[PDB]
Amino acid sequence: VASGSGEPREEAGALGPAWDESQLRSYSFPTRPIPRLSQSDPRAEELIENEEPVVLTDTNLVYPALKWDLEYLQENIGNGDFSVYSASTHKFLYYDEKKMANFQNFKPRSNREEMKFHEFVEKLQDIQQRGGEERLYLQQTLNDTVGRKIVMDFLGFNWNWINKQQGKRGWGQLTSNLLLIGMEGNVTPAHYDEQQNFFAQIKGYKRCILFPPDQFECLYPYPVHHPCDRQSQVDFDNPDYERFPNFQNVVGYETVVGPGDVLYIPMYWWHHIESLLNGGITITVNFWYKGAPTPKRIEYPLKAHQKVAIMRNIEKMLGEALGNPQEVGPLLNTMIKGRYN
Amino acid sequence: VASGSGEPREEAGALGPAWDESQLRSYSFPTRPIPRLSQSDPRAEELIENEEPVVLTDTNLVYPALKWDLEYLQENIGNGDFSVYSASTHKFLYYDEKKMANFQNFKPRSNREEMKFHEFVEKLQDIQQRGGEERLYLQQTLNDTVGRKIVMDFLGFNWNWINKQQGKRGWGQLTSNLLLIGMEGNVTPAHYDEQQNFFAQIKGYKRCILFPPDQFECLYPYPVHHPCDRQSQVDFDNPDYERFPNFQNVVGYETVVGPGDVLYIPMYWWHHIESLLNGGITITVNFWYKGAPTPKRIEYPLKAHQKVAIMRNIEKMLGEALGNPQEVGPLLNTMIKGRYN
Ligand SMILES: O=C(O)CCC(=O)C(=O)O
Ligand SMILES: O=C(O)CCC(=O)C(=O)O
Ligand SMILES: [Fe+3]
Ligand SMILES: [Fe+3]
C-alpha cells in the first residue's frame, strides 16, 4: 500500500504523538514508506549495500548533538560566518552562483547572506516576534572556526560506526558536514546529489520524500548548465502536466525523521525535504561521502544512476565543444527530431 | 532565381541540345544552379577553398577515359571482381553491411553481387534485350587487377592538376577512385560523405543536386548506427511532411554534368545523383581525399559540418557507453523531453 510515512510514532513516557498527518503538506503522487530499522539488523545492511534508502533509529551517530538548540549553539558555535538563505515562500529553490553567468534571465527568488550566529538568531526572533511571513534557512559547512564545546560534541559523534560504513561500502572520503537549521514549514524541493549521504536528524521532525534514479523521466531536472542543475523543474504544489506529463507516473518513498534518526540518502536519489508545519525549528547534520570508485569493466545492464551520469557528461561536453551552453538545446533537438523520436 | 540546371548546353558542331528538361525527374523543392567555370578562373579557386561546389569544365582530369564505353572496358579492364548493385526501383538506397547486425528489421531492397566485367555487360544486354524493368549499378574501386591499357589511361589522367588541388587545400591523401557505371534513370538518393570529392564525368549526363551541411535539419539522416547511416530518410518522390516537416524548407544547388566536367562535391555536402532518363548508360570516376586535418584551437563560431561531426560522435559514444545502439534513442529522448524542447 501507499500509507506513506505510516502511523505517527508514539514518544516514550506517553508524551503523545510525535507529530500528525496535518503537519504534512499535500501532493499529487502516492508514496510507500522507507523502512525504519536498527543498525544491528542485517536488512538495513543489505539496503545500504544495494543503494536503497533506510532510516536507522539507533546509530547514536550524533548523540552529543541531541542537546543542541539555538541558545546552546549561540553560546558555543564560534564567531565564524554562517551562510543563510532567505525566501518569500516556503520553497527554497537553490542556485549555483558560478552558473548564473550563463543564464541572464535568471533573477533569484532566494538570496544568500553571510552573518554571525547571533545575527541569524536575532533575525529569526525579530521575524517570529513581529509575526512576519518571510522565511530563513541556515546552511553552513562545519569548519575550523567553531567553539571548543562544539568540537567536543563533534568528537563524540559515532565515528566508529560511520567509518565502518564508509569502509564496507568502498566509499571515498568524508567531504563535509553541513549544518542545516530551518524554520517550520520550510521546503527544500526535489533534487539529487552526487555523493552518498547520512542525514542525521537532531532537533525537530522532517518529512523526507525520495525517488529512485530511474525516475529521471518523471522529474525533469534543469539543464546541467542552468543554475538549478540537479533540481526538478516541476512545482510540487502546482504541477504542470502539459510540460511534465510523466510527473503523473511518479511514486515516492517517504518517511518522517526525528531526533536520533539517520536517513541514508543514496547517491543520485531524488529527495524532497520539508520541516513539519507548526513543528518548530529543525536541525540536521549531513555526512557527505564520495561514492565508491566506478569499476573497471562496466557490467551490463547499466544502473540507472550510471545512465544519469552519462546524460550529464553528454551535456557538459556538448557545452564545451560548442563553446556556449545556450546552444546545447538546439543541437540536441536537431539531433533527435525526425531521427530518434 | 531558381532556374536549377539552367538552359541546356548546346553541343559543338550543332549536334543539338545535350539533353532537355524532360529527362529530369520532378521534385518538391527549388534549386539554384552550381556555377560552371574554368579551372583557370580564380572564382573557381575561391569556391573550392570555401568548400562550396563548382563544376570545372576544362580540367582534363580524366581526358584518357573520355573514350571509354562498355566494349572498350570489357576488352581491357581485367578479370578482377566488380561489385554490382541491383534494384527493383530507380532508387538505389545503400546499406553498410557491417551494420546490418544491429538492426534486424532491415531486409534490403538493393542486393550486392560480385561478378566479372563481361557478366555485368551480359546481364545488362540480357535485360535491355528482353525489355525488362530491373536496374543495375556497377560501383567498384580501381585496384591492381586492371588491364594495361586501362592502367595507361589512368596514368594519363591530369595528376599535375589534382595533386596541386590536394596540396593547396591541405587535404590528406587520395583514398580511392570509384568507378560508377549505371543505367539511364538510376538514382543515388541524398546522402553525404566524409571526404572531399572530385566527381569526374565520362560518359552520359548526370543530374547532381547538392544541399549544404547547414540543412541537416531538413534532410533527416538515419541514425549513425543504422545501415543507412548518412542517407536521408526522406523519400524525394513521396515526401512525408508529417515525419519530416522541415523538408519543406529545403533548397538545393543543382547541375548537369557531362563528359569532361568535374564536380567538386565538398565534404559533408549532401548529394542526390541521377542518370538522365532515356539518356543511355553513364560513367563516372570519383577522386576521394581525406579532408584537411582539424585545426588546433577551434575558432568560433563553428562551421555546420563541425556541428555535424559532433552530433555523429555523440551518437557513436553513446552507443558504446550503453553497450547497445538500440538504446541510443530512448536515452536521447529522456535527455531532452521537458528539458530542452
Ligand atoms: O534538510 C534539507 O532541507 C536539505 C537536505 C539535503 O538536501 C541534503 O542533505 O542533501
Ligand atoms: O554517381 C552516383 O550515383 C553516386 C556518386 C556519389 O555518391 C559519390 O561519388 O559520392
Ligand atoms: Fe540534497
Ligand atoms: Fe556520395
Nearest 5°: CA angle at B339, between B337 and B341? 65
Q: Which of A335, A117, A320 is nearest to B335 (CA)?
A: A335
What CATH number was assigned to the domain covering residues A1-297? 2.60.120.10
Which residues make Cβ contacts (< 8 Å) with residue A12, sequence separation at least 6?
A: none
- In this structure, what are the phi and psi dihedrals at residue B281, rounded to the nearest 5 degrees? -80, 160
Q: Which H or E run contains A100?
A: none
Q: Which H or E run contains A329?
A: helix A328-336
Does any CB of chain B come closer than 8 Å to the CB of residue A73? no
Secondary structure E strands in chain A: 10-11, 16-17, 31-33, 36-37, 54-56, 81-87, 112-116, 135-141, 174-182, 187-192, 196-203, 206-211, 252-257, 262-265, 270-275, 282-289
Residue found by looking up cell 546552444 in the block: A327
Dist. CA B235–CA B220, nearest whole Å: 11
Look at phi and psi of residue A43 and say left if phi exceeds 0, alpha if psi is from -120 to 50, else beta: alpha
Dist. CA B114–CA B118, nearest whole Å: 12
Handedness of CA B81, B82, B83, B89 (dihedral sign): negative
B interface mutation test: which of A224, A327, A340 has the most B CBs within 10 A? A340
Does any CB of chain A come closer than 8 Å to the CB of residue B307? yes
Dist. CA A292–CA A290, nearest whole Å: 7
Dist. CA A33–CA A49, nearest whole Å: 19
- Residue B249: exposed, middle, or buried by beta-carbon count in 10 A (0-12, 13-18, 19+)? exposed
Does any CB of chain B come closer than 8 Å to the CB of residue A248? no
- Residue A241: exposed, middle, or buried by beta-carbon count in 10 A (0-12, 13-18, 19+)? exposed
Number of H helices, E strands in chain A: 8, 16
Dist. CA B216–CA A25, nearest whole Å: 49
Q: Mapping DSSP to helix (H, G, I), strand (E, B) and coil, where does residue A82 land?
A: strand
Q: Which of A141, A132, A138, A117 is nearest to A182 (CA)?
A: A138
A interface mutation test: which of B241, B244, B336 has the most A CBs within 10 A? B336
Handedness of CA A34, A39, A40, A43 (dihedral sign): positive
N- to C-terminal Cα distance for chain B?
A: 35
Q: Quick one: three-class SS letters along chain B?
A: CCCCCCCCCEEHHHCEECCCHHHCCCCCCCEEECCEECCCCHHHHHHHHCCCCEEECCCCCCHHHHHCCHHHHHHHCCCCEEEEEEECCCECCCCCHHHCCCCCCCCCCCCEEEEEHHHHHHHHHHHHHHCCCCEEEEEEECCCCCCHHHHHHHHCCCHHHHHHHHHHCCCCCEEEEEEEEECCCCEEEEEECCCEEEEEEEECCEEEEEECHHHHHHHCEECCCCCCECEECCCCCCCCCCCCHHHHHCCEEEEEECCCCEEEECCCCEEEEEECCCCCCEEEEEEEECCCCCCCCCCCCCCHHHHHHHHHHHHHHHHHHCCCHHHHHHHHHHHHCCCCC
C-alpha grid cell, residue A270 = 531524488
Architecture of the CATH domain B298-341: Orthogonal Bundle (1.10)
Per DSSP, A276 falls in state P
Dist. CA B174–CA B298, nearest whole Å: 25
- In this structure, what are the phi and psi dihedrals at residue A105, rounded to the nearest 5 degrees? -75, 75
Residue found by looking up cell 501532493 in the block: A27
Which residues make Cβ contacts (< 8 Å) with residue A41, sequence separation at least 6?
A: none
Residue A20 C-alpha to ligand 3 middle, in angstroms? 25
Dist. CA A235–CA A242, nearest whole Å: 13
Q: Is the CB of B201 under 6 A from ligand 2?
A: no
Which residues make Cβ contacts (< 8 Å) with residue A205, sequence separation at least 6?
A: A18, A19, A23, A256, A257, A258, A275, A276, A279, A282
Q: Beta A282-289 vs B16-17: how paired, if at all?
A: unpaired
- Find out whether A288 and A178 touch, Cβ atoms under 8 Å: yes
The CATH 2.60.120.10 portion of chain B extends over 1-297
Which residues make Cβ contacts (< 8 Å) with residue B77, sequence separation at least 6?
A: B117, B146, B147, B150
C-alpha grid cell, residue A264 = 541514508
Residue found by looking up cell 549561540 in the block: A74
Dist. CA B254–CA B11, nearest whole Å: 20
Q: Which H or E run contains A96?
A: none
Does any CB of chain B come closer than 8 Å to the CB of residue A241? no
Dist. CA B116–CA B125, nearest whole Å: 14
Count Cβ neighbours within 10 Å for each residue of A248-281 and write b for 16 or more, e otherwise: eebebbbbbbbbbbbbbbbbbbbbbbbbbeebeb
* Cβ neighbour number for residue A197 with a 10 Å cutoff: 20
Handedness of CA B4, B7, B12, B15 (dihedral sign): positive
What is the distance in angstroms between the Cα of A83 and the nearest Cα belonging to chain B? 30
Task: Give strand pairing partners of A82.
Answer: A115
Q: Is the CB of B273 under 6 A from ligand 2?
A: yes
Residue found by looking up cell 521534385 in the block: B27
Dist. CA A195–CA B333, nearest whole Å: 26
- Find out whether B264 and B197 touch, Cβ atoms under 8 Å: yes
Nearest to A332 among B221, B243, B335 (CB): B335
Q: Measured between alpha carbons, how far is residue B273 from residues B6, B206, B267 in Å?
A: 17, 7, 16
- The answer, yes or no, to whether the previous bond of A239 is cis (omega within 30 of 0) is no
Q: Which of B295, B81, B276, B76 is nearest to B183 (CA)?
A: B276
Handedness of CA B27, B30, B32, B34 (dihedral sign): negative
- The answer, yes or no, to whether the previous bond of B301 is cis (omega within 30 of 0) is yes
User: CA dihedral in degrees (A10, A16, A18, A19; nearest 10)?
Assistant: 120
What is the distance in angstroms between the Cα of A329 and the nearest Cα belonging to chain B? 5
The CATH 1.10.287.1010 portion of chain A extends over 298-341
Which residues make Cβ contacts (< 8 Å) with residue A111, sequence separation at least 6?
A: A85, A86
Residue B273 C-alpha to ligand 2 middle, in angstroms? 6
Handedness of CA A70, A72, A75, A76 (dihedral sign): negative
Dist. CA B251–CA B209, nearest whole Å: 10
Dist. CA B256–CA B279, nearest whole Å: 12
- Find out whether B252 and B208 touch, Cβ atoms under 8 Å: no
Which residues make Cβ contacts (< 8 Å) with residue B143, sequence separation at least 6?
A: B80
Dist. CA A287–CA A263, nearest whole Å: 10
Atom of ligand 1 nearest to the CA of A187: 3
Question: Do you know the residue count of chain B?
Answer: 341
Which residues make Cβ contacts (< 8 Å) with residue B212, sequence separation at least 6?
A: B253, B269, B270, B304
- Find out whether A171 and A292 touch, Cβ atoms under 8 Å: yes
User: CA dihedral in degrees (A249, A253, A257, A262; nearest 10)?
Assistant: -130
Residue with CA nearest ligand 2 atom 9 = B286
Nearest 5°: CA angle at B81, between B78 and B86? 125
Does any CB of chain A come closer than 8 Å to the CB of residue B214? no
Dist. CA B198–CA B54, nearest whole Å: 10
Method by which this entry was solved:
X-ray
